[PDB]
Design a protein around this ligand. Structure first.
Ligand SMILES: [Zn+2]
Ligand SMILES: [Zn+2]
Length: 61
């Protein structure tokens, strides 16, 4: 499936889990499980493939 309208802030890469991590200084966001698994392959910012300098925990409240 490819749906822009999600039930919550659900990570579009995964659907099952929401966003919890921001990829600075770009600001693109996804689930923590994304980047941790991605560091076994690359260090790029997924949706634009920019170099992630810092992976911080994006608080939603
Ligand atoms: Zn980006
Ligand atoms: Zn994800």
């Amino acid at each position: 499936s490819h749906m822009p309208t999600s039930e919550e802030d659900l990570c579009p890469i995964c659907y099952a889990h929401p966003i919890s991590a921001v990829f600075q200084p770009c600001g693109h966001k996804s689930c923590k499980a994304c980047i941790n698994q991605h560091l076994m392959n690359n260090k790029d910012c997924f949706f634009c493939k920019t170099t992630i300098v810092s992976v911080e925990d994006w608080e939603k409240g």
